[PDB]
Design a protein around this ligand. Structure first.
Ligand SMILES: *[C@@H]1O[C@H](CO)[C@@H](O[C@@H]2O[C@H](CO)[C@@H](O)[C@H](O)[C@H]2NC(C)=O)[C@H](O)[C@H]1NC(C)=O
Ligand SMILES: *[C@@H]1O[C@H](CO)[C@@H](O)[C@H](O)[C@H]1NC(C)=O
Ligand SMILES: *[C@@H]1O[C@H](CO)[C@@H](O)[C@H](O)[C@H]1NC(C)=O
Ligand SMILES: *[C@@H]1O[C@H](CO)[C@@H](O)[C@H](O)[C@H]1NC(C)=O
Ligand SMILES: *[C@@H]1O[C@H](CO)[C@@H](O)[C@H](O)[C@H]1NC(C)=O
Ligand SMILES: *[C@@H]1O[C@H](CO)[C@@H](O)[C@H](O)[C@H]1NC(C)=O
Ligand SMILES: [Zn+2]
Lengths: 118, 195, 596, 108
């Protein structure tokens, strides 16, 4: 089981990007993917969640700005990011979530990719 | 393959007032959470104690669908461990509340230019309400120590007041329809699972 | 149970029903304003009557709540605000007589009409008839004639009636346990029960006096420059040392000296900073102007404005058959409804006015979570000052170049600085002495410090002492000069335009300190500075819950009204005024008069 | 949203010692808490779920306790590799999950 991130780089403010995560070692059609970003000081911050039945969740400051998606055939996770501001500079990780009943937790993350805006 | 009446709750023509919020018991049916997601964000969709993603393959005994209408700025009081008008006097949720809250704006449906006064809330009460307790009696609230004799006057006020929704209200005061799905897990077969 | 809980419950009831009825009345008034029809007038009148009756009933019911057995400051403030509203303390006969006095004030002021000699058919009203001739004509005789005719055909009709109004209002105020009606007006600045933030009602007079004493050199230099330029325009009409005539002050009353800019141009060879040509070239509409204003407002971190603002508020004149008032106003209908009412054109002045109204909307939105009685500025001057600081920031060339409204080839220089600063000082600096003298005169008349037989005699004394303005024709006691103004006749407190000014630069100079601005304060622009936005919003969200002293200190760091930022804002202008007036006499003598 | 806090912000301990780090929520959340460890240059790794249960494969020296508002994560014996940043995350409110500010555990 592994998760590999890609798509980070330097982009201009107000641009768009497509981050990708490749998952291996487990069935992609049984886990619910997440995108979590980390910045210095503010710490970790959940950014996106996608489940089995085509449902997408984002925070109030992120909803209407990003777009999560999944491909079970390719076992891949994608994140469209648009209207980028100066606060989006962060290290992004793709997360596999599993629930031991009523309790939900992030089992394993990837390696993360750094996105900076100038 | 009898789908649970979630369309009856969410697509109801007229929702109920918050002081007597419409509580519907859902049991012995296939729970169709499979279509509660493609309606896009409503304005708020928060599941406390559970996760929205894992709402397909978990068994529940009874589903309490509590439908009512409040304002936008006040739906934040629909949450465990919250204080406010709804929590104290209209609708209380326990600290151990396990369920979901679905809040969507209904300015198109629940507003009138002349004012939609059909929605009422209890503004005054002697004591705060316990979780899942409904009070419908409209006895005159006594503020002072002098008797009220059941007639409004000094320190004597009617407990129920009017939202009076109009389409030009702001987002915080627009008519938001709120459905609280309360999930109970007891020593029961819990016939509400869903494939 | 304690009386505090009873007061809290009654205040909750009043909050709810007052919110509902106020929204009803505001919606009816907005419908009338955007669409003047008989049915709209009837609906507005019905809503206003219901709102007023409810307010009177609630104040009457609240009068049996004693003030000093409730210890909560917010509850006490709301109870005092509600009890202060009810004026039903005297008998119904004299109350109705006083209402008749007020109605007579309004009708006589509104229907004032002056007929020129030898032609009692070609008569003009004050607006737009006499206002245009005051603000545009330069003929000494015509402006003098209009001045005397309007102050004689209306003031004489109001003088003894205004004395009766003063007597009745003094009786009502003493019936409300106040020293006079002036004490009643100063009660808006009163703070009690807060340790270290108390503000006695008599302290306002002393504070305003001290602030004017600090102002005086700047106003003296500006008056000297204006008088010198007018003497250049009128070689044989104004003495170099005498007071400025009252009929040569831009408008009639001399409230604003803006219209003298063409008579007081610093550099007549270079045009000022105007984006109207850029507005036409890029083909901007009202919606684009308001969207760029909202972009400016959100650049400093101010929150999103509801889409209902764009949906409901009319930005362009409907025209055709639908007639609407074209006065830019910011409507806070309550229950989350914020609108702007103005017939926007393709003009930079309309751009600045849109910014001012949008700042008013921001201020209204800030305290939307406060109780209904506290949903207002902490005093009478915070709201318009907060509205004006936004027009101050927007008008700077930095914002014009930031959003593409100004060509980058244009370079800011000290000439544009001087032009803009003098154009502002013709508005800010000019109105402060007039507001001071009018409010002080009304305060001491209410106190009774002026006997009636010396009203005008003293009214023109301050004009020769405070504003440095001499009347063109002497007036006896039959005249009533202050009643000729809209505010005095209609009985609106006028000090709110003084302190507001002294706030609009206290905030700005504070915000520029949070924006790390380098250079003159006139060139400061708070855009792209979230620190200044948060600092401002900290005071904006307070509303009337906290004392106005604490609200002011929340931004400026000082617990009292200050004018040092006002002088700092005009510091390069004040230095230029010193340079220009080093060879010109500064000061006015009361003995000099145009009629000698 | 539920604001989450951790204590102490900075911490130093020797190898083999026992350490306890506390986590506090703005409101009662029951036993819906998780503990993650993040070493420098690496992504955070799950340690504890449900605030009292052990993840598969993690050493038993990590333990979690507490319910309601106060939670504690205890390491009976400290290893040199334990120098990291520890995060507590509430799973009671979804999908807007929030993490703790992160407590730093060094090696003396
Ligand atoms: C009592 O309160 C009412 C609030 O509606 C006051 O009426 C408004 O007063 C403001 C300024 O004070 C005006 O700008 C509005 O136009 C007024 N509206 C109406 C409908 O009258 C009223 O002046 C207050 N009266 C006293 C004695 O305080
Ligand atoms: C309500 O009806 C609409 C239209 O038929 C449908 O799209 C929607 O899914 C219904 N809502 C629910 C909860 O089924
Ligand atoms: C203006 O009001 C009249 C009657 O009050 C109404 O007939 C008309 O439709 C209104 N105009 C608009 C544009 O709403
Ligand atoms: C006043 O009442 C309000 C609302 O009940 C409360 O929040 C506040 O703490 C009270 N203040 C004092 C000093 O009791
Ligand atoms: C709300 O404000 C943000 C900037 O803070 C802006 O990006 C967004 O477009 C605004 N919302 C709408 C509906 O325009
Ligand atoms: C503006 O600056 C220039 C640069 O030296 C100077 O020559 C000029 O006199 C200044 N303008 C005024 C009004 O002093
Ligand atoms: Zn204004």
């Amino acid at each position: 089981v592994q998760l590999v991130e890609s798509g980070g780089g330097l982009v201009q403010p107000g641009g768009s990007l497509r981050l990708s995560c490749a998952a291996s070692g487990f069935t992609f059609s049984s886990y619910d993917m997440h995108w979590v970003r980390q910045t210095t000081g503010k710490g970790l911050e959940w950014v996106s969640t996608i489940g089995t039945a085509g449902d997408t969740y984002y925070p109030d400051s992120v909803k209407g700005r990003f777009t999560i998606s999944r491909e079970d055939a390719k076992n891949s996770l994608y994140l469209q990011m648009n209207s980028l501001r100066a606060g989006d500079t962060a290290v992004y990780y793709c997360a596999r979530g599993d629930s031991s009943g009523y309790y939900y937790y992030f089992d394993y993350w990837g390696q993360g990719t750094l996105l900076t805006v100038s | 393959t009898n789908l649970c009446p979630f369309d009856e709750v969410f697509n109801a023509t007229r929702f109920a007032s918050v002081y007597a919020w419409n509580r519907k018991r859902i049991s012995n049916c296939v729970a169709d959470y499979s279509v509660l997601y493609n309606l896009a964000p409503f304005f708020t969709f928060k599941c406390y104690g559970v996760s929205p993603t894992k709402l397909n393959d978990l068994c529940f005994t009874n589903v309490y669908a509590d439908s009512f209408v409040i304002r936008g700025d006040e739906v934040r009081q629909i949450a465990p461990g919250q204080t406010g008008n709804i929590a104290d006097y209209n609708y209380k949720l326990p600290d151990d509340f396990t369920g979901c809250v679905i809040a969507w704006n209904s300015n198109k449906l629940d507003s009138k230019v002349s004012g939609n006064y059909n929605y009422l809330y209890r503004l005054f009460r002697k004591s705060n309400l316990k979780p899942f307790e409904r009070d419908i009696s409209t006895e005159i609230y006594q503020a002072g120590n002098k008797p009220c004799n059941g007639v409004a006057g000094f320190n004597c006020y009617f407990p129920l007041r009017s939202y009076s929704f109009r389409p030009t209200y702001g987002v915080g005061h627009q008519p938001y329809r709120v459905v609280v799905l309360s999930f109970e897990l007891l020593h029961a077969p819990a016939t509400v699972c869903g494939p | 149970s304690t009386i505090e809980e009873q007061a809290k419950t009654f205040l909750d009831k009043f909050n709810h029903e007052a919110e509902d009825l106020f929204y009803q009345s505001s919606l009816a008034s907005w419908n009338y304003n955007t669409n003047i029809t008989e049915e709209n007038v009837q609906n507005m009148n019905n809503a206003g009557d219901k709102w007023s009756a409810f307010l009177k009933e609630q104040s009457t019911l609240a009068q049996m709540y004693p003030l000093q057995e409730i210890q909560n400051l917010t509850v006490k403030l709301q109870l005092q605000a509600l009890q202060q509203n009810g004026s039903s303390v005297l008998s119904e006969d004299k109350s109705k007589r006083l209402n008749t006095i007020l109605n007579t004030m309004s009708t006589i002021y509104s229907t004032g009409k002056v007929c020129n000699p030898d032609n009692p058919q070609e008569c003009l009203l004050l607006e737009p008839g006499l206002n245009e001739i005051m603000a545009n004509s330069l003929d000494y005789n015509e402006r003098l004639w209009a001045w005397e005719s309007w102050r004689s055909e209306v003031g004489k009709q109001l003088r003894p009636l205004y004395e009766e109004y003063v007597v009745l209002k003094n009786e009502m105020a003493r019936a409300n346990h106040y020293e006079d009606y002036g004490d009643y007006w100063r009660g808006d600045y009163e703070v009690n029960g807060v340790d270290g933030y108390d503000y006695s009602r008599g302290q306002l007079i002393e504070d305003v006096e001290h602030t004017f004493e600090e102002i005086k050199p700047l106003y003296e230099h500006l008056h000297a420059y204006v008088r010198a330029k007018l003497m250049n325009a009128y070689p044989s009409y104004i003495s170099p040392i005498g007071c400025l005539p009252a009929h040569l002050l831009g408008d009639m009353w001399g409230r604003f000296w803006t219209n003298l800019y063409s008579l007081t141009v610093p550099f007549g060879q270079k045009p000022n900073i105007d984006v109207t040509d850029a507005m036409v070239d890029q083909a901007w509409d009202a919606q684009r102007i308001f969207k760029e204003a909202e972009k400016f407002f959100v650049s400093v971190g101010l929150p999103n404005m509801t889409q209902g603002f764009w949906e409901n508020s009319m930005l362009t004149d409907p025209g055709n058959v639908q007639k609407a008032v074209c006065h830019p106003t910011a409507w806070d209908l309550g229950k989350g409804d914020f609108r702007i009412l103005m017939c926007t054109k393709v003009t930079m002045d309309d751009f600045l006015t849109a910014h001012h109204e949008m700042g008013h909307i921001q201020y209204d939105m800030a305290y939307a979570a406060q109780p209904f009685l506290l949903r207002n500025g902490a005093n009478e001057g915070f709201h318009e000052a907060v509205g004006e600081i936004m027009s101050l920031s927007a008008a700077t060339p930095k914002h014009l170049k930031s959003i593409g409204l100004l060509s980058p080839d244009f370079q800011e220089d000290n000439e544009t600085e001087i032009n803009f600063l003098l154009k502002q000082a013709l508005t800010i600096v000019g109105t402060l002495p007039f507001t001071y003298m009018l409010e002080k005169w009304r305060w001491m008349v209410f106190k009774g410090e002026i006997p009636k037989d010396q009203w005008m005699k003293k009214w023109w004394e301050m004009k020769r002492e405070i504003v440095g303005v001499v009347e063109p024709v002497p007036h006896d006691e039959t005249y009533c000069d202050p009643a000729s103004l809209f505010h005095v006749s209609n009985d609106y407190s006028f000090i709110r335009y003084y302190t507001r000014t002294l706030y609009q630069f206290q905030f700005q100079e504070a915000l520029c300190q949070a924006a790390k601005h380098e250079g003159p304060l006139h060139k400061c622009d708070i855009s792209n500075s979230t620190e200044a936005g948060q600092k401002l919003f900290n005071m904006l969200r307070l509303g009337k819950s906290e004392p106005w002293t604490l609200a002011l200190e929340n931004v400026v760091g000082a617990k009292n009204m200050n004018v040092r930022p006002l002088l700092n804002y005009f510091e390069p202008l004040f230095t230029w005024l010193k340079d220009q007036n080093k060879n010109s006499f500064v000061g006015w003598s009361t003995d000099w008069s145009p009629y000698a | 949203d539920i604001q989450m806090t951790q204590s102490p912000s900075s911490l130093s301990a020797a190898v083999g010692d026992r350490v306890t780090i506390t986590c506090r929520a703005s409101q009662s959340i029951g036993s819906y808490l998780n503990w993650y460890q993040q070493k420098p240059g690496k992504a955070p790794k799950l340690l504890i779920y449900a605030a009292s249960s052990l993840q598969s494969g993690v050493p038993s020296r990590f333990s979690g306790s507490g319910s309601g508002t106060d939670f504690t994560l205890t390491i009976s014996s400290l290893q040199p590799e334990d120098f990291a940043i520890y995060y507590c995350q509430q799973s009671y409110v979804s999908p807007t999950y929030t993490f703790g500010p992160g407590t730093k555990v060094d090696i003396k």
